[PDB]
Structures are given as C-alpha cells and as structure tokens.
Amino acid sequence: TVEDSESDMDDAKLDALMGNEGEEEEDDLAEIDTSNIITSGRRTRGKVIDYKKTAEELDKKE
Amino acid sequence: RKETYSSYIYKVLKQTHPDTGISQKSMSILNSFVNDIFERIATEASKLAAYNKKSTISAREIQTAVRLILPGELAKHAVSEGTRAVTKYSSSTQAQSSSARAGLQFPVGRIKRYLKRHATGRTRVGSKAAIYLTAVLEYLTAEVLELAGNAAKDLKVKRITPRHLQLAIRGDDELDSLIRATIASGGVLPHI
Known part of the structure; x- marks a missing residue:
C-alpha cells in the first residue's frame, strides 16, 4: 500500500x-x-x- | 472500520507509550470520541458559522465552540496549545510541510478534508482552523490514552481495554459529562 507515505505531505495541499x-x-x-x-x-x-475507589473519591471529592 | 486514524494513532500509540497495542474497540471509542469531539467542535463552529454567515471557519469559530464544548479547563489548555500552535506553525510559513510544521503529525489534510466534505459550505479552512482541530485532538486524544495507557499498563495489561476507559472516562466527571460516547464494553458502572 504505502510507498512514500510518512505524513503523506501531499495532502494538506491537494485538499x-x-x-x-x-x-x-x-x-x-x-x-x-x-x-x-x-x-x-x-x-x-x-x-x-x-479499582473504582478512585471513580468515587473523584466523582465526589476530586 | 475502514482505516480510521489507526496509523497516525499507532504513531501516537508507540510514542505515548511503547507498550500499548491498544484494544481495537478502545481504538473505536477513542476514534469515536476523536471523531465525535471532532464533530462537536467543527459542528458548533460550523453552526455559529452557518448562522453567522461567517463561513470562514477561523480559530475564533472553533475557539468559541471549543470554549462552549469543552467544560473549560480542558478548553483552557486546548486554546492555549491551539494558539501557540498557529504561531510556531505560521512562524515559518506554509513553505515546508503542514504535516510537519503544524507540529502535529495528526491528519492535517484528511481532517481538513472532513471540514471540506462535511462542511462543504464555502469552508476555505484558513490555517486558523485545521490546526486548531489537530491540536485539540492530539491534546485530548493523547490525554485519554495517556491516563489509560500509563495506567492500563501499570494496572495489569499493556493492551488497554474499554474498562481502563470506564475510569479514564466515567472517572473524570468533566470528560464523562463530555465524552458519554459509548463505553458499551467496559462501562460496567450501572447495571451489574
């Protein structure tokens, strides 16, 4: 598939x-x-x- | 499934952490978020812009949305990183490589495309936008993965699962009230 992809580069312009x-x-x-x-x-x-304990100590004290 | 931001993420996956093969669905929830938060912003921007006739989706359009979208704290950093970004991004000039100058190896042309095909409303997408979207994504995208990534591996498995997200998402009340995307796999918080 790729052959020189790497960031593509040839995209932000064409679009x-x-x-x-x-x-x-x-x-x-x-x-x-x-x-x-x-x-x-x-x-x-x-x-x-x-351990959820943090899901509460947070969903309440945080 | 198509292709999703699998590749580039895979790059933000090894970079954020070398031990993160990430769960496919965790890649769907993030991708869905990244994709949904991409819309939430670009949607309101395209909204206060379709009504303002502004059409020119500028940093100010997405900034407001970002400010109206993101609870705020996240926004505060989303707009701080987004600004400093247009600077270093424009400091030189679009004469080198946007997929390298934006300082964000995130789909600058593909997303810019999500703004051209989805908006298709005379959206020139001035450099004052496409980047604000790639900056806010790599920010929260790398954040959600950073919490669950460094935690899912310090918790038990490098291959994070929608569960570590159950916390990283339902845990941070702010995000929760903002993501509430799916978590239909690890969101084992209500019914047991």
Whole structure:
C-alpha cells in the first residue's frame, strides 16, 4: 500500500487547494494567556488508580 | 472500520507509550470520541458559522465552540496549545510541510478534508482552523490514552481495554459529562 507515505505531505495541499484565506499569519497569535499555567499535550499525569475507589473519591471529592 | 486514524494513532500509540497495542474497540471509542469531539467542535463552529454567515471557519469559530464544548479547563489548555500552535506553525510559513510544521503529525489534510466534505459550505479552512482541530485532538486524544495507557499498563495489561476507559472516562466527571460516547464494553458502572 504505502510507498512514500510518512505524513503523506501531499495532502494538506491537494485538499486545501481551496486557497485558504491566507490569513495564516493573522491566524491568532494573541489569545495566549493561560499557557503560563495549564499545560499538557506532551506528558499529562493522573494514573487514575482504577479499582473504582478512585471513580468515587473523584466523582465526589476530586 | 475502514482505516480510521489507526496509523497516525499507532504513531501516537508507540510514542505515548511503547507498550500499548491498544484494544481495537478502545481504538473505536477513542476514534469515536476523536471523531465525535471532532464533530462537536467543527459542528458548533460550523453552526455559529452557518448562522453567522461567517463561513470562514477561523480559530475564533472553533475557539468559541471549543470554549462552549469543552467544560473549560480542558478548553483552557486546548486554546492555549491551539494558539501557540498557529504561531510556531505560521512562524515559518506554509513553505515546508503542514504535516510537519503544524507540529502535529495528526491528519492535517484528511481532517481538513472532513471540514471540506462535511462542511462543504464555502469552508476555505484558513490555517486558523485545521490546526486548531489537530491540536485539540492530539491534546485530548493523547490525554485519554495517556491516563489509560500509563495506567492500563501499570494496572495489569499493556493492551488497554474499554474498562481502563470506564475510569479514564466515567472517572473524570468533566470528560464523562463530555465524552458519554459509548463505553458499551467496559462501562460496567450501572447495571451489574
């Protein structure tokens, strides 16, 4: 099947050939604010010791 | 079943954890979530946009949805990671590789396609969107798998099952009230 897949790359264009507003530079770059406190998408933490005991100590105290 | 985000996930599966052959259905629930949360957002975005005539689904459209969708805390990080993303993503320029510049090896063109075929409403999908969707997915997608992944293996088996999800999902009240997708296999919480 694959032969040069790897991210494909030849996709975001063939489909976003729509042109795209091009405002890419003005995407947003501003709303940033809670980025100095809440963090994730890299190595979250929780484990969540199942046994359900945590499903309660949490579904109630948390 | 078709193909699902099996491959790329498989990449976020080995990366999130090297011992995670993940249960097929756990791949269906996540995929269903990832697919459902993909809609919940892009749906409301496409909603407050179909009514606003905005049509131009920008970061602000999905941001609000994300803000109205996600309980908030998750959103707070979903919008923080999504913003910083357009930055490093646009910092250079779409002159290298979106499936590498977005900083997210998640289907940027295939999902962008889910926005073109599903929305098909003059949705140009400015760089101010497709990424916000790949960023929020890898965020919660990697999160649900991170909790159950590092836990399902520290609990008993590397091949997580809808059960470890029963917790990772019904456990986190927020997500629960937000996922409530299926859990029809490990959600052994009500009827015994």
